[PDB]
């Protein structure tokens, strides 16, 4: 409409945190072009969504049930408790039973009714054995009673959506211009690969430097591959100071032609360096001007050598020899899906004819389309090393086959993977969009993962923003309402975190002018702004309402984060236990998100091989620059705050918090499990050496790391843990022979997915850890995983580690103390 369309786009702009209608920072219509283009995908998914299963969004997995979780249910029977008003009864169910089965069973024993979960916004519905729901599978993990309130199915009317040449390519470098030696290096890149490179003559380094030079390259105009970047860089002794890119071929297949004034990025190897976006800070940024006016058999020994190349890790560099060997035998390599990354990385993309052949390869592709989806393999074809629409599209095609349970597992990295797409509209984008709209849960975390970057990343906010809007216009009017509240809450509570922080610096400790000011500001919100109830952004199912002013402190840390607690705004909550958020400024929680996400993935791995290291990957979302919220683990304490250089303290503290030897032997169990998991998970990611301050433990033995900021001893295994494990400097015990038992059993489980991990660790570095990431930085996880060696001298390798941490004891922790 007029004002009604303006109000709708005004709302969308407020939810996004960025204006997608703004054009004061483009030089084409690709961002606009994408908006119009993504409509069809949007409308198609919206059209074909089961309104009932959508509103209720059953969180389900089609995976088996772990050995350990089969034990809890030792009778092919499961106890589910149903409530109505204040009514209550207990039903015995078969693991292979159905929501409908059990429901009808209750009615006949004692329509239009559905089983909702107690305290949450979770639904136990669908044609799935209830031994396949996540909530049910969760209770069993923590040994709990599946409480379920029975009421009416929610109205889908709420999820409603509103009505809508053969010349050598040459480029002239006019000159650079900055408000307040030097030369220019104009590369033609294609997926990290450099095809041609031309520099300008060195000149004095002043605010305005002109060359008026035509830079001819070695490449024809037809040899230019779609997705090729013109990478303009600026060097001074000598160092890279400014970079900017420009897609040689545009979003509509046209060869770019004309005059360009480009504002660059300055520095201070990663994902930010291949963006088609220009610095929007015209007032301060450097500028740059340019002109565009343009079968058979195979020998035994050779097969052997080809099969050795295809076996190596994804970080193993390809020799020229290797590459030519791959490409001469492409049809024998196509037999093997695990040879695809290396195959297309051995393609000369700077040759029209070759690329032509390559597309002839992807014609079929019979074997690829028939391979059991290898996610670790699919990720490799979506990284920086690949920029061919067709290559990346066979990876996205392979993603189309996983359940929603797995999309959630990788949503974060797939979203960050968008940073590698050359164009805005892409198989990947449209996929995150298609899958988000179809599942309420995915759409939720999608929102916050995009908003995370749209708000603190100038390099990509424009692209992500066009994608977010795409999702918002088809998520539902019920989802929109929700999001608007969540945005207001963090918008308010962030004010309070920054305002409070400026009232005190290091050495501030805490004074009661703050304990008065803080508990005075939570009023303004409570009685005016703060909504009656807002959905928790790290746990969608949990609604939180009123505040708990009394229990809201201001952490006495090196900086000032908040300790907020809320009352569950849901009446039917099984018990009482506040929801605690920690609003923090000063750290980058986008690095935390990444580690926590990989932690969840290591769980799923350990799950396939029936292990349970009971990790504690708490929720953690990044809201803005250097600011975000964390989920407060209940009944947890720091080892540091536990000793405030003694060993027995841990045991005393556990026993103190554990009434009976039974509820204490579990506290040493949960401890040994959680301890092994965190010792392995950490050693692999190279974030092993921590301080006693950055490790916590619940009153029930569960150990868990925190604050993975910018993170001598392979990992924290101090004698204080050992005392709990009944061991003292060099002596051996059962719980310690059980410790080495769990560890190696888990460490090897990960080595079975070396390829997957490596690609996530790699990508994580490029999209999450700034700035320059060496090729040597990644080389770590290889050795940390011991690529190659059998499960023999590999387990031995790891068991050497466990020993170092014992023969070091407190050494490092004490050295940490020195400041």
Binding residues for ATP: 580-589, 615-623, 704-711
List all residues 6 or more positions away from 410 whose beta carbon is below 8 Å from its beta carbon: 375, 379, 601
Sheet containing strand 703-705, strands side by side:
636-638, 695-698, 703-705
Contact 349, 385 (CB under 8 A): no
Cβ proximity to ligand WYF: between 256 and 559 the closer is 559
Cα separation, 442 vs 438, whole angstroms: 8
Contact 483, 15 (CB under 8 A): yes
Record the tokens describing residue 302, joined without a space.
């050779």
H or E element at residue 69: helix 67-72
CB 398 to ligand WYF: min, Å = 33
Cα–Cα distance list, 107 to 100, 113, 150, 188 (Å): 11, 10, 11, 70
Cβ proximity to ligand WYF: between 274 and 602 the closer is 602
Contact 25, 32 (CB under 8 A): no
List all residues 6 or more positions away from 268 whose beta carbon is below 8 Å from its beta carbon: 771
CB 483 to ligand WYF: min, Å = 24
Cβ proximity to ligand WYF: between 513 and 557 the closer is 557
CB 763 to ligand WYF: min, Å = 20
In DSSP notation, 478-530 reads: HHHHHHHHHHHHHHHHHHHHHHHHTT--TT----HHHHHHHHHHHHHIIIIIS
CB 536 to ligand WYF: min, Å = 14
CA 748, 749, 753, 756: dihedral to nearest 10 degrees? -110
CB 707 to ligand WYF: min, Å = 3
Record the tokens describing residue 759, joined without a space.
């690609």
Record the tokens describing residue 671, joined without a space.
């401890």
CB 226 to ligand WYF: min, Å = 41
CB 572 to ligand WYF: min, Å = 26
Cβ proximity to ligand WYF: between 46 and 632 the closer is 632
Name the percent of the chain in helix, strand, coil, to the closest 5: 45, 15, 40
Chain breaks in the chain (C to N over 2.5 A) after: 110, 164, 180, 236, 268, 294, 644, 711
Tell me the CB-side half-sphere exposure of residue 37, using CA atoms within 13 A: 17
Cβ proximity to ligand WYF: between 462 and 578 the closer is 578
Cα separation, 482 vs 468, whole angstroms: 15
List all residues 6 or more positions away from 310 whose beta carbon is below 8 Å from its beta carbon: 333, 336, 338, 339, 342
CB 589 to ligand WYF: min, Å = 7
Contact 347, 358 (CB under 8 A): yes
Cα separation, 722 vs 647, whole angstroms: 8
DSSP 3-state assignment of 27?
coil
List all residues 6 or more positions away from 480 whose beta carbon is below 8 Å from its beta carbon: 11, 15, 472
Cβ proximity to ligand WYF: between 340 and 538 the closer is 538
Please state the residue numbers annotated as binding site: 580-589, 615-623, 704-711
Cβ proximity to ligand WYF: between 273 and 590 the closer is 590
CB 220 to ligand WYF: min, Å = 52
Cβ proximity to ligand WYF: between 170 and 585 the closer is 585
Chain residues in the site for ligand WYF (CB under 6 A)? 555, 557, 561, 582, 584, 587, 592, 618, 620, 630, 632-633, 636, 706-707
Contact 245, 186 (CB under 8 A): no
Cβ proximity to ligand WYF: between 260 and 618 the closer is 618
CB 297 to ligand WYF: min, Å = 57
Please give the residue whose beta carbon sits closest to ligand WYF in the complex.
707
CB 681 to ligand WYF: min, Å = 14
CB 595 to ligand WYF: min, Å = 8
Record the tokens describing residue 647, joined without a space.
């060993």
Cβ proximity to ligand WYF: between 616 and 675 the closer is 616
List all residues 6 or more positions away from 393 whose beta carbon is below 8 Å from its beta carbon: 427
Helices (H) and strands (E) in the chain, counts: 30, 22
Give the pairing of strands 78-84 and 146-151. parallel
Give CA angle at 560 (559, 563), nearest 5°.
Answer: 135
DSSP 261: E
CB 600 to ligand WYF: min, Å = 14
Give the number of other CB atoms < 10 A from CB of residue 529: 11
In DSSP notation, 645-656 reads: --STHHHHHHHH
List all residues 6 or more positions away from 27 whose beta carbon is below 8 Å from its beta carbon: 260, 262, 278
Cα separation, 794 vs 744, whole angstroms: 9
Cβ proximity to ligand WYF: between 702 and 755 the closer is 702
Cα separation, 453 vs 462, whole angstroms: 10
Cβ proximity to ligand WYF: between 215 and 667 the closer is 667
Cα separation, 120 vs 123, whole angstroms: 9
Tokens 């994580």 sit on residue: 764
CB 632 to ligand WYF: min, Å = 5
CB 474 to ligand WYF: min, Å = 33
Cβ proximity to ligand WYF: between 653 and 739 the closer is 653
Cα separation, 233 vs 240, whole angstroms: 7
Cβ proximity to ligand WYF: between 173 and 630 the closer is 630
Cβ proximity to ligand WYF: between 42 and 584 the closer is 584
């Amino acid at each position: 409409m007029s004002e009604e369309s303006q109000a709708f786009q005004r709302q969308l702009t407020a939810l996004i945190g960025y204006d997608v209608t703004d054009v004061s920072n483009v030089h084409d219509d690709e961002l606009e072009f994408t908006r119009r283009g993504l409509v069809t995908p949007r409308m198609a998914e919206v059209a074909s969504r089961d309104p009932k299963l959508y509103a209720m969004h059953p969180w389900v997995t089609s995976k088996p049930l772990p050995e350990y979780l089969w034990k809890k249910i030792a009778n092919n029977c499961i106890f589910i408790v149903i409530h109505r008003s204040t009514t209550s009864q207990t039903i015995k169910v078969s693991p292979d039973d159905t929501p409908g089965a059990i429901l009808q069973s209750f009615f006949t024993k004692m329509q239009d009714f559905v089983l909702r979960v107690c305290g949450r916004d979770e639904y136990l519905v669908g044609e799935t054995p209830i031994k396949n729901f996540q909530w049910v599978r969760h209770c069993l993990k923590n040994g709990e009673e599946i409480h379920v309130v029975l009421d009416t199915p929610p109205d889908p009317a709420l999820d409603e959506v509103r009505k809508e040449c053969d010349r050598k390519f040459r480029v002239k470098i006019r000159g650079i211009d900055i408000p307040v030696t030097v030369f220019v290096e104009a590369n033609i890149q294609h997926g990290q690969q450099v095809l041609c490179q031309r520099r300008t003559s060195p000149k004095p380094f002043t605010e305005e430097v002109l060359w008026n030079v035509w830079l001819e390259f070695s490449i024809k105009i037809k040899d230019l591959p779609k997705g090729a970047l013109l990478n303009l860089q600026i060097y001074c002794k000598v160092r890279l100071l400014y970079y900017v890119n420009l897609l040689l071929i545009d979003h509509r297949f046209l060869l770019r032609r004309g005059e360009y004034v480009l504002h660059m990025w300055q520095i201070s190897f990663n994902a930010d360096k291949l963006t088609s976006a220009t610095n929007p800070d015209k007032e301060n940024s450097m500028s740059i001007s340019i002109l565009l006016d343009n079968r058979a058999e195979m020998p035994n020994q050779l097969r052997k050598q080809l099969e050795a190349i295809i076996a190596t890790d994804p970080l193993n560099p390809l020799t020229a020899e290797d590459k030519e060997l791959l490409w001469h035998f492409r049809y024998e390599s196509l037999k093997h899906p695990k040879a695809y990354p290396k195959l297309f990385s051995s393609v000369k993309w700077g040759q029209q004819e070759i690329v032509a052949k390559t597309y002839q390869l992807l014609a079929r592709r019979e074997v690829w389309d028939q391979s059991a989806l290898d996610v670790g393999l699919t990720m490799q074809l979506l990284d920086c090393n690949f920029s061919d629409e067709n290559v990346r599209a066979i990876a996205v095609q392979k993603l189309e086959s996983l359940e929603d349970d797995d999309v959630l597992h990788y949503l974060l990295q797939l979203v960050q993977a968008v940073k590698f797409e050359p164009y805005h509209d892409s198989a990947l984008a449209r996929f995150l969009l298609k899958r988000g709209l179809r599942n309420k849960r995915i759409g939720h975390f999608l929102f916050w993962f995009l908003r995370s970057e749209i708000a603190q990343s100038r390099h990509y906010q424009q692209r992500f923003a066009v994608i977010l809007e795409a999702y918002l216009r088809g998520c539902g009017t019920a989802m929109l309402h929700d999001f608007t509240q969540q945005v207001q809450v963090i918008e308010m509570l962030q004010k309070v975190t920054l305002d409070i922080k400026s009232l005190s610096a290091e050495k501030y400790d805490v004074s009661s002018q703050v304990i008065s000011q803080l508990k005075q500001k939570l009023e303004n919100l409570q009685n005016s702004q703060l909504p009656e109830s807002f959905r928790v952004p790290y746990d969608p199912g949990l609604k939180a309402g009123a505040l708990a002013i009394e229990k809201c402190k201001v952490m006495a840390s090196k900086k000032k984060p908040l300790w907020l607690e809320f009352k569950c705004a849901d009446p039917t909550a099984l018990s009482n236990e506040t929801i605690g958020i920690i609003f923090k400024h000063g750290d980058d929680l986008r690095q935390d998100m990444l580690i926590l996400q990989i932690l969840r993935i290591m769980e799923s791995i350990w799950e396939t091989e029936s292990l349970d290291l009971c990790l504690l990957p708490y929720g953690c979302i990044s809201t803005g620059d250097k600011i975000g919220m964390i989920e407060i683990v209940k009944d947890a304490t720091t080892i540091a705050k536990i000793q405030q250089f003694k060993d027995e303290v841990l045991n005393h503290w556990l026993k103190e918090k554990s009434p009976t030897e039974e509820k204490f032997q579990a506290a040493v169990e949960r401890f040994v499990y959680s301890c092994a998991g965190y010792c392995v998970a950490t050693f692999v990611l190279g974030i092993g050496d921590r301080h006693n301050d950055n490790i916590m433990i619940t009153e029930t033995g569960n150990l868990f790391h925190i604050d993975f900021g910018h993170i001598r001893v392979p990992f924290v295994l101090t004698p204080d843990f050992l005392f709990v494990m009944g061991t003292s400097g060099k002596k051996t015990s059962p719980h310690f022979q059980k410790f080495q038992d769990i560890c190696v059993k888990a460490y090897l489980a990960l080595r079975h997915h070396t390829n997957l991990l490596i690609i996530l660790f790699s990508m994580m570095l490029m999209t999450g850890m700034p700035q320059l990431t060496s090729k040597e930085d990644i080389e770590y996880i290889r050795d940390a995983l011991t690529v190659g060696k059998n499960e023999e001298d590999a387990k031995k390798y790891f068991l050497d580690q466990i020993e170092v941490c014992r023969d070091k004891g407190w050494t490092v922790q004490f050295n940490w103390f020195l400041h």
